[PDB]
Amino acid sequence: ELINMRRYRNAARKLIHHYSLNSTSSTEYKISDVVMTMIFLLRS
Amino acid sequence: INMRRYRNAARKLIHHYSLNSTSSTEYKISDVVMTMIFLLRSEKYHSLFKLLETTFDDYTCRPQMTQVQTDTLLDAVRSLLEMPSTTIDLTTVDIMRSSFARCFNSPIMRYAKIVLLQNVALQRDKRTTLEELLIERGEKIQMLQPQQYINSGTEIPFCDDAEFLNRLLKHIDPYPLSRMYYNAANTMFYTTMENYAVSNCKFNIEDYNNIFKVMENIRKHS
Amino acid sequence: STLEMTQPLLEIFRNKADTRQIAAVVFSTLAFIHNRFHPLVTNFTNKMEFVVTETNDT
């Protein structure tokens, strides 16, 4: 098995921070990124 | 030892330096001394008391509180203002502290030296400019869609019964007038200069001087 | 009062409960000023959404 949970978590945390606090749209960030977020959350 | 009276002065001083300082001539060196004594008595508040006394042109090894200690400090603050509806950011308190530093560094006497300035002590080692406001910019606005629009309660309403509204007016007649302004409008939209909390671009008396030349036109042109 | 029996002001503005009432307050007040300065052209058509922002950085 080989997955970069590390970078995934990193981007995901950054995401969740800004997203949950801005409460609004994420033009910097992408669907791939939220996907990796949920991936982290499944594997953790 | 009228701890009671001393506290009573202290709270007034707190509001006067923090926010919405509607009061006048609040200042009294004896009263602030009573404040310091009250602080000393306040064993629970000794942390804040020592922080405050620390105010001098040195300030290396700031308190460096753990966030827990800061939270307890804010608890004290709210318990001592006894108007806890908000917890202000520590930075406002540190700014009042800088004002107290000015108070210390003052061989200033019978002369009526009103401070007559907004303190510049909010800095984070940055520089700021009016045209640079265009660079602060609404790129963020472009990065955000507006939340929503809907038609509900739609279009153009209009006024209700004049007589009922006079009935309501009668409750308004008793109240004083223009003191409401002198409290709210004056204080609030003077202190709006707080917005310079963003790396303190300087205030400019000049455009605020618009007010007379702009309002005059009503009378000037009947 | 006509505006849905306007509810307690400062908390209605507080709490991030619903953008809708905030936007309605804004629109209605603006139309009111429009009318006061001149009832001759009572209103203005253009629909739009509106932005709230939550950060000192703005």
Q: Which two tokens stand for residue A2?
A: 């080989």
Radius of gyration of chain A (CA): 11
Among B137, B130, B138, CA closest to B206: B130
Write out chain A residues lying below 8 Å of B145, CB-based: 24-25
What lies within 8 Å, CB to CB, of B191 at 6+ separation is B19, B20
Q: Which residues contact C52 (CB under 8 A, 6 or more apart)?
A: B147, C19, C22
Neighbours of C12 (CB within 10 A): 14
- CB atoms under 10 Å from CB of B128, counted, come to 15
Tokens read off for B72 = 């307890």
Count other C-beta atoms under 10 Å from residue B39's C-beta.
Answer: 21
Nearest residue to C21 (alpha-carbon basis) of B152, A24, B146, B159: B152
In 3D space, the residue among B124, B116, B90 whose CA is nearest the CA of residue C57 turns out to be B124
Helix (H, G, I), strand (E, B) or coil at A14: helix
Q: Are B6 and B36 in contact (CB under 8 A)?
A: no
Å resolution of this model? 4.8
Helix axes B29-41, B46-53, angle to 10 degrees: 140
CB contact under 8 A, C2 and B149: no
Give kind and range of the element (H or E) at residue B16: helix B3-18
B11/B63 Cα distance (integer angstroms): 23
Hey, are the CB atoms on B144 and A24 less than 8 Å from each other? yes
SS3 of residue C50 by DSSP:
strand
**Cβ distance of B144 and C2 shorter than 8 Å:** no
Strand partners, C50: B148
Q: For residue B126, how far is the Cα from the chain centroid?
A: 22
CA-closest candidate to residue B93, choices B127, B65, B125, B114: B65
**Method underlying the structure:** cryo-EM
Interface size, chain A vs chain B, as Cβ–Cβ contacts under 8 Å: 10
Please indicate whether, in this complex, the C-beta atoms of C48 and B149 are within 8 angstroms of each other: yes
Q: What angle do CA A24, A26, A32 make, to 5 degrees?
A: 135
